[PDB]
Design a protein around this ligand. Sequence first.
Ligand code: CL
Ligand code: CL
Ligand code: CL
Ligand code: CL
Ligand code: CL
Ligand code: CL
Ligand code: CL
Ligand code: CL
Ligand code: CL
Ligand code: CL
Ligand code: CL
Ligand code: CL
Ligand code: CL
Ligand code: CL
Ligand code: CL
Ligand code: CL
Ligand code: CL
Ligand code: CL
Ligand code: CL
Ligand code: CL
Ligand code: CL
Ligand code: CL
Ligand code: CL
Ligand code: CL
Ligand code: CL
Ligand code: CL
Ligand code: MG
Ligand code: MG
Ligand code: MG
Ligand code: MG
Ligand code: MG
Ligand code: MG
Ligand code: MG
Ligand code: MG
Ligand code: MG
Ligand code: MG
Ligand code: MG
Ligand code: MG
Ligand code: MG
Ligand code: MG
Ligand code: MG
Ligand code: MG
Ligand code: MG
Ligand code: MG
Ligand code: MG
Ligand code: MG
Ligand code: MG
Ligand code: MG
Ligand code: MG
Ligand code: MG
Ligand code: MG
Ligand code: MG
Ligand code: MG
Ligand code: MG
Ligand code: MG
Ligand code: MG
Ligand code: MG
Ligand code: MG
Lengths: 174, 174, 174, 174, 174, 174
Amino acid sequence: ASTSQVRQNYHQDSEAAINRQINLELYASYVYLSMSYYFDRDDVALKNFAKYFLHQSHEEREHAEKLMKLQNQRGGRIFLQDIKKPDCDDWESGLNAMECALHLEKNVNQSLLELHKLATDKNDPHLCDFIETHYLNEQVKAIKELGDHVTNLRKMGAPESGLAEYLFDKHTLG
Amino acid sequence: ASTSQVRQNYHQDSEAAINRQINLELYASYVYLSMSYYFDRDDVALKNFAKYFLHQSHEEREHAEKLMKLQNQRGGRIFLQDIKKPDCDDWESGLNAMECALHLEKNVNQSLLELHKLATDKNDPHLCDFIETHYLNEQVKAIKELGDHVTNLRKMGAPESGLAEYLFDKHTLG
Amino acid sequence: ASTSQVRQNYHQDSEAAINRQINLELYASYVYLSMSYYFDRDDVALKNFAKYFLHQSHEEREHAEKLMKLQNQRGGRIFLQDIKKPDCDDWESGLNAMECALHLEKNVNQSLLELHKLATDKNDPHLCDFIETHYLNEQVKAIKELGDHVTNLRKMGAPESGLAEYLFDKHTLG
Amino acid sequence: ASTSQVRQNYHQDSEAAINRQINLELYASYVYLSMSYYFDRDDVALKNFAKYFLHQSHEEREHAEKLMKLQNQRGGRIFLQDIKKPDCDDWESGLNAMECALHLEKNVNQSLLELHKLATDKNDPHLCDFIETHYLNEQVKAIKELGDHVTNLRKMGAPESGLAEYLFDKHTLG
Amino acid sequence: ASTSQVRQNYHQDSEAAINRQINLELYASYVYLSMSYYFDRDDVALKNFAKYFLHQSHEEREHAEKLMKLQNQRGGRIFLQDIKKPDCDDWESGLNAMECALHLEKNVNQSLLELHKLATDKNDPHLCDFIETHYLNEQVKAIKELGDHVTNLRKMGAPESGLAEYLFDKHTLG
Amino acid sequence: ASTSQVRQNYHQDSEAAINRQINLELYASYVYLSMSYYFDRDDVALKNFAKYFLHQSHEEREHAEKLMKLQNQRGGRIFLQDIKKPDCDDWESGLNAMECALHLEKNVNQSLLELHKLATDKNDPHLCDFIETHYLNEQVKAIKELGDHVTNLRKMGAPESGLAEYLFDKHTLG
Ligand SMILES: [Cl-]
Ligand SMILES: [Cl-]
Ligand SMILES: [Cl-]
Ligand SMILES: [Cl-]
Ligand SMILES: [Cl-]
Ligand SMILES: [Cl-]
Ligand SMILES: [Cl-]
Ligand SMILES: [Cl-]
Ligand SMILES: [Cl-]
Ligand SMILES: [Cl-]
Ligand SMILES: [Cl-]
Ligand SMILES: [Cl-]
Ligand SMILES: [Cl-]
Ligand SMILES: [Cl-]
Ligand SMILES: [Cl-]
Ligand SMILES: [Cl-]
Ligand SMILES: [Cl-]
Ligand SMILES: [Cl-]
Ligand SMILES: [Cl-]
Ligand SMILES: [Cl-]
Ligand SMILES: [Cl-]
Ligand SMILES: [Cl-]
Ligand SMILES: [Cl-]
Ligand SMILES: [Cl-]
Ligand SMILES: [Cl-]
Ligand SMILES: [Cl-]
Ligand SMILES: [Mg+2]
Ligand SMILES: [Mg+2]
Ligand SMILES: [Mg+2]
Ligand SMILES: [Mg+2]
Ligand SMILES: [Mg+2]
Ligand SMILES: [Mg+2]
Ligand SMILES: [Mg+2]
Ligand SMILES: [Mg+2]
Ligand SMILES: [Mg+2]
Ligand SMILES: [Mg+2]
Ligand SMILES: [Mg+2]
Ligand SMILES: [Mg+2]
Ligand SMILES: [Mg+2]
Ligand SMILES: [Mg+2]
Ligand SMILES: [Mg+2]
Ligand SMILES: [Mg+2]
Ligand SMILES: [Mg+2]
Ligand SMILES: [Mg+2]
Ligand SMILES: [Mg+2]
Ligand SMILES: [Mg+2]
Ligand SMILES: [Mg+2]
Ligand SMILES: [Mg+2]
Ligand SMILES: [Mg+2]
Ligand SMILES: [Mg+2]
Ligand SMILES: [Mg+2]
Ligand SMILES: [Mg+2]
Ligand SMILES: [Mg+2]
Ligand SMILES: [Mg+2]
Ligand SMILES: [Mg+2]
Ligand SMILES: [Mg+2]
Ligand SMILES: [Mg+2]
Ligand SMILES: [Mg+2]
């Protein structure tokens, strides 16, 4: 019930929005962890899909940690919620997982754009800069990469061609 | 509704128990992540407590990943649940966090001992060996380290002595 | 008709079971040798299938040698039998050979699990540890690898697609 | 009269059995120290027998230290007893010392097997794993090495041939 | 029931004779494996006899593999038979094992000389050259080495002198 | 019942006194081993006290070995007795252990001074030189070091200040 000695120009609504973004980044980490181990199943067996999604999982945990750092740097207080189990699930094919990841990354981007419009509305240029520097271009690049992956799997003949997914695994994700 | 081609001597109850252990390891990862960022607050400011618990968080994620690998190696199917928010919370002091971590690691050890007694009861020597090789001695060492930490903080005069926690941070956790 | 000076807690039934396992490992070495040279035929011509199975042959001979060492370390006496010619034979395709190897490795694993249950029943913890340390996880990994191989050959369109087997040879077994 | 904060699944009988094993390892260290200096006498003068047994003495002290570490890791309390003087004594010849060492190592192994059966009976898989990992195979190898040494000294013509013991000293123990 | 596209000047009788030689080389590999582990027994304990025969075992497996390669290079088809258990057995002494190996290598040489006389009779100069280049001088050197070993063990006083076998182990086979 | 060929100017009383000193050095080794593992307890947890006393334990074993060497060099015969369990025990605090070690090292020094006065009385200048060269200054330095340690722990506020013992552990014994 006392103010942080560091807190300055950091609105309560921005603090709460950062806590929601921390949960979403941890959720995205968990989705990619689930997708990774789907491709490690003996009846799927696409090792470079598995490595690609595990690396994406580890990168989302780093995104979450940087937002936790941000909350403390500005004198807000971290508030954690349960990390929901992955809600795309029933992964089906390399193409379907890539399509789920594209939808996930577009939903994360929309959250970040809402967060930026809140920080704009509260005239918080430090938070705006943080989001722009560390999150917005990384999301645009992630979305473009996943779109490229979905396109090549479609053009190659996935998901009906198991040869398509096999060769994509070796040539793009190797 | 068809059996994995790799599955052999892997009981349904063992499969389900491994899924419960995966959740518990992810929960422990989340507890240590929360504890880490408590010590990064500007009104706590113990950077080596923060680094120690972040490293412990990263090690629990690795424990979880190895159990997910184990589930696929044996032809079981991973089933994920929500990762609950940390339930010790209200961290208070370096001593209180160390005491919460000791209780967490003893609860994880009791889960692993129950898992080993199930694998014994189902005559699954591969699973017994996996638990013994990768988990049981790591838990005994973690518990002994946390006990040692709690003892030194108590003897030094924590939690009343902020000088105790400061000097422990520099000398033990540096 | 006199006891070994080293023998201690080594039951006659365990001694005989180790001799049976030595034969089985030499049999598995011979199966993989036969499979290797099938892929070196001019009308098959898949050089990385041939190298993969030759390496597996050499690893089974090492498994057999380590059990012969074990028999002498415990003061048992090696008893050798004929090494039967390979009984899957008529190798047909890369997929069929991989399926034969998966069945072989599951039969070896079942032998090892029976051996472990005998050593358990005779309270021989050294033999139990030997089997767990040197054999059980190597069998789980071999079975998982062969399952993954069978899955990718099926998904790629083998055995009807000779292009599938050719490209698997280059990308997975290269 | 209060429980260790680390203690979990560690039976009082296991604690006491570990204390007895600590004494036995220190006793074995003392036997090999005595045997070492017998071979350094001017009327024995077999320098590589002396070095071999001194190294064995140093290895038994390390075994004892690791059990003392184990007792503290599990939250038991070390209880020390007198280390008895060596009870084979009157060393006589290189062959007789090797035969005394073989009997010592078989008695230590029987102690360890009793300790493992107690840990099994109390469902202590961590202690079972500790004994299997650090002690049982080291005892099997020690016993096999000593048997081999006794055999070669016998076949060479010891203890009547002082030339046998001299040449064994140079070629096997050099 | 169709001819290999590579087959040229390769008589059916030569093909069958190569298959018989493959079995004999695998048999010789198995004899030397059995002899190796006899010298690893605790009541024999001649480690350099054991290493010498294990290396000879590994060299006979290589001989067998090269004949399997030869069969495919010429467009013949490998036909495998059971590998008989060793038929000298009851190894007795280093001298007796060396005498068994000398007899084995003379029987292998007589097989190879019969194979060369068949290839001569069918005017197959490639097969004649293969046998001469890769097998005949290696057999003459093996036989001469084993004769030299038998001579030195006899002259030293084996098998009655266990000191002879011990010192041969160190000086010739070290 | 025959004299050593090397023995010269080595009185029976000196021989017996060296045997008593060997026991005392082994006793001192055992005291420091016990003290070491007291500081490794989870409810003590002073790792550099534990390392300091373990090193002191290892140095006393070396002292004992050098006296065993001395006994053989002079043609005396080693006579071993039981190594008594540590008789200070109930270690209490870093200060109390340091005070016990100071008393132990003063008792060892008094034994060595008695041994030197016996060697003087028997006109054994080699034994006098041995004691002076290898033992007397090492004892004076050990006693001075332990006194310095006791003084600093007292001045720092031990044993009531657990912070004193903690910081001494880091700064003096690190
Ligand atoms: Cl304000
Ligand atoms: Cl909030
Ligand atoms: Cl929640
Ligand atoms: Cl860019
Ligand atoms: Cl079943
Ligand atoms: Cl489940
Ligand atoms: Cl859930
Ligand atoms: Cl450890
Ligand atoms: Cl300080
Ligand atoms: Cl018996
Ligand atoms: Cl048998
Ligand atoms: Cl047979
Ligand atoms: Cl693994
Ligand atoms: Cl209890
Ligand atoms: Cl006790
Ligand atoms: Cl006692
Ligand atoms: Cl071994
Ligand atoms: Cl030499
Ligand atoms: Cl023709
Ligand atoms: Cl044939
Ligand atoms: Cl046959
Ligand atoms: Cl030549
Ligand atoms: Cl005299
Ligand atoms: Cl005496
Ligand atoms: Cl006594
Ligand atoms: Cl000095
Ligand atoms: Mg949300
Ligand atoms: Mg990414
Ligand atoms: Mg992200
Ligand atoms: Mg839900
Ligand atoms: Mg930028
Ligand atoms: Mg749970
Ligand atoms: Mg940890
Ligand atoms: Mg864990
Ligand atoms: Mg809740
Ligand atoms: Mg077990
Ligand atoms: Mg281990
Ligand atoms: Mg069989
Ligand atoms: Mg293999
Ligand atoms: Mg095998
Ligand atoms: Mg048959
Ligand atoms: Mg292992
Ligand atoms: Mg005892
Ligand atoms: Mg040893
Ligand atoms: Mg020992
Ligand atoms: Mg007595
Ligand atoms: Mg081991
Ligand atoms: Mg034949
Ligand atoms: Mg050869
Ligand atoms: Mg040959
Ligand atoms: Mg037969
Ligand atoms: Mg030539
Ligand atoms: Mg005394
Ligand atoms: Mg000292
Ligand atoms: Mg001393
Ligand atoms: Mg007493
Ligand atoms: Mg003087
Ligand atoms: Mg001096």
